[PDB]
Amino acid sequence: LVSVNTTNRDGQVLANKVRSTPVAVSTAREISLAPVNKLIDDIVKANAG
Amino acid sequence: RVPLGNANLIGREELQHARDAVTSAQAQLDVAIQQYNANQAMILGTKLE
């Protein structure tokens, strides 16, 4: 049950501001490729002689 | 042929030709060896499977 005050009505009805900061950033599910690079180096070294 | 030339019993062009023949044979052998090595790069001495 919500009761909203209206005594002060200095007009601002539609938002008119921007911000350079995101909302709800999620980083999990971003993979680091180091181990696969190590595997690739190992494979390349084995077939060069 | 070298000893005869040492005593000056053959022309010097004959010695030059023989020495150049030795060098050319060496170069041809090098070509053959490198060809064989190139072929062996695709096997690397591993079993068939």
UniProtKB/Swiss-Prot annotation, chain A:
It is found in: Cell inner membrane. Disulfide bonds: none annotated. Part of the tripartite efflux system EmrAB-TolC, which confers resistance to antibiotics such as CCCP, FCCP, 2,4-dinitrophenol and nalidixic acid. EmrA is a drug-binding protein that provides a physical link between EmrB and TolC. Homodimer and homotrimer. Part of the tripartite efflux system EmrAB-TolC, which is composed of an inner membrane transporter, EmrB, a periplasmic membrane fusion protein, EmrA, and an outer membrane component, TolC. The complex forms a large protein conduit and can translocate molecules across both the inner and outer membranes. Interacts with EmrB. EmrAB complex forms a dimer in vitro. Belongs to the membrane fusion protein (MFP) (TC 8.A.1) family. This is Multidrug export protein EmrA. It comes from Escherichia coli (strain K12). The lineage of its organism: Bacteria, Pseudomonadati, Pseudomonadota, Gammaproteobacteria, Enterobacterales. The gene is emrA. The chain holds residues 342 to 390 of 390 of the full protein.
